[PDB]
Amino acid sequence: CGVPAIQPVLSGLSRIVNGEEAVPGSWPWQVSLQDKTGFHFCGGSLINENWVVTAAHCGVTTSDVVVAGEFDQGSSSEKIQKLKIAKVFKNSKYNSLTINNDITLLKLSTAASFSQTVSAVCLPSASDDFAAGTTCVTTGWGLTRYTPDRLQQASLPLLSNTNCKKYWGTKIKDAMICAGASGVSSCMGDSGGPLVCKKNGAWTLVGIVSWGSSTCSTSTPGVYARVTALVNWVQQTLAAN
Amino acid sequence: CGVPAIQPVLSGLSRIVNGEEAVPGSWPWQVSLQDKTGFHFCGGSLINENWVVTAAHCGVTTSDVVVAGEFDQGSSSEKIQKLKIAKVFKNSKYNSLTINNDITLLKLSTAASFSQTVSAVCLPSASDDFAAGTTCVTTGWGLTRYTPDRLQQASLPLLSNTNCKKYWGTKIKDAMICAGASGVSSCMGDSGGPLVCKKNGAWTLVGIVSWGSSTCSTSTPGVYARVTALVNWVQQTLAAN
């Protein structure tokens, strides 16, 4: 896990304004979530061939589909896997008013076929420490909400929650983590999309997109679900189903 | 319904900055929603002795309590009714990502005792037309989220959805309505709290608080669930339960 067969290329432009285009297939856990009608509404991350992790505030149901292997949402030409959802597991601690504990698991009906362009992100241990100032990467088609239809990426640093409160105040809870405000926007991440950091040669899922600056400010950090705080619940859910 | 036994007094100060204090008991349908621990997290409105209407994004469950007859949340001295919730009816069309169709009904276990300070707001017909520019009133303890602990009120005008889109863009859906940006803030309304307008001597529930300006701007309108679009669902739910 965490080692793409097609390696990401990250340039200085990933650090400013709205990031830059990714190399196709270089973020192989990134999936798109489409509703009954084919409309892309959220992101998510494969954690193995049968399970996708996304945000609870996406409100995914079993009439939505998981789309793997995608790069260009405007191309009907690329090999993709449209996978049906058999069951949705929303974290019971999710507070839909503060958006705290913002995580949901999706169990697929049939397994994805892992390949060079479809494979799993690594999950952290609950005890892992990702320090403030660490450069991490967020990816998604979140800029289409306002414009390129190809997968974008940005490099942005983690913040301590204390420093994140200077921007967002009391909305920041312990199961949250912030990144950005470094002169680059966080809006390329879809709701539910990944924030990953490279630990010992492998990319690890550190955050899930919860919300960001209402104006895509380059000086306002994104707020993510903190995966260390929720990974025990993830592993308990996989073991019981 | 819609005719308080204690009549509201609304002065010019209800029109600017953060509104003004209400006369005690003059908004008798206003309830407070408290969790297991007594913490006030949302508002709502009585529509009869057995049913409270609030917003779906409040995520109310049967371990929360409805508190009626309140004025001063810091006073342990006033007569109030703490009412248990027997069942929660979230509108199935609620989209937790756009906050569209943001309405939930609460059926009480035991009826409230209606009085001078506890009584019901009127519901509109689906076909009622509340025109842009109509002065309406929002009430709540929403300023405690940042400060007075007594019930506040503000007068603010309705906007057409077209004009509301100039502020909020594509987040405005048909089951929504906006009010304010007239030099007064909308933040005194709790999530799920009422927006009422006086039609033929009776106060009618026109909106339910969905979200507002992240900085409580006096030039940014509040966004509410549009009750005309959801009242048929309300009446269908009351008739089947």
Curated annotation (Swiss-Prot), chains A, B:
**Where the protein is mainly located, per its record?**
secreted
What are the protein's UniProt keywords?
Digestion, Disulfide bond, Hydrolase, Protease, Secreted, Serine protease, Zymogen
SMART domains documented for this protein: Tryp_SPc
Q: Where is the signal peptide?
A: none
Paired cysteines (S-S): C1-C122, C42-C58, C136-C197, C164-C178, C187-C216
Q: What is its EC number?
A: 3.4.21.1
Question: What's a Pfam family this protein contains?
Answer: Trypsin
Q: Which reaction does it catalyse?
A: Preferential cleavage: Tyr-|-Xaa, Trp-|-Xaa, Phe-|-Xaa, Leu-|-Xaa
Residue ranges of every copy of the Peptidase S1 domain listed in the record? 16-239
Q: Which InterPro entries match?
A: Peptidase_S1_PA, Peptidase_S1_PA_chymotrypsin, Peptidase_S1A, Trypsin_dom, TRYPSIN_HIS, TRYPSIN_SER
Prodomain positions: 14-15
Protein name, per record: Chymotrypsinogen A
Specify the taxonomic lineage.
Answer: Eukaryota, Metazoa, Chordata, Craniata, Vertebrata
